[PDB]
Amino acid sequence: PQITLWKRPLVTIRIGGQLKEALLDTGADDTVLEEMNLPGKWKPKMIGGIGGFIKVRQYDQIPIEICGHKAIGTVLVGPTPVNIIGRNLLTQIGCTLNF
Amino acid sequence: PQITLWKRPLVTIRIGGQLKEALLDTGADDTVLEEMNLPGKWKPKMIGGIGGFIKVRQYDQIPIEICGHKAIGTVLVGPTPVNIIGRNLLTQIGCTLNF
């Protein structure tokens, strides 16, 4: 799809078998989801945003279907204000900015 | 133009008498610029993201050129670690996400 930016670019994702809403976020390096359970091993990590650093759990090689497009990659879980799809997965689904 | 997301989508912007590098950020409702001493009236505001909130100064109807595209709108100024072009200006320059 082509998505204009008058509204937040929120899309439905499927991850760990469950549907969630998430923000397509070109200003995010990484994909960060609100507190949830995911299978497998994770590693403690820290990331910075506006207003400082948080602790997250890093899950590697996690499949997510983003608006009907398949990705498999790193998913961080922690106290983000909203579920965000970052560049690591935006690139996988062929997402570009155009003007 | 088309901008892929392998790296941060940083572009040159012009505001006041200053050229700066700023993120084209679909995840940002607002445009947030690093500390700069702009003339004119402003209103205090708080904005938040991953690591919590920061204090900013809200300036309205500020002309800003992004990648040679003119825009005019609200600019928040404060201790952000990166210059952020939010959806309020991305819409003005005709920016879309596409996949």
Ligand SMILES: CNC(=O)CCC(=O)N[C@@H](Cc1ccccc1)[C@H](O)CN(CC1CC1)S(=O)(=O)c1ccco1
């Ligand atoms: C490893 N770090 C990241 O991936 C950054 C994730 C992030 O917080 N991105 C911000 C933009 C940003 C990038 C780098 C440093 C600081 C900020 C995101 O794209 C825009 N934010 C809102 C989205 C998290 C929901 S925001 O907090 O910066 C913002 C922008 C305007 C008002 O708030």
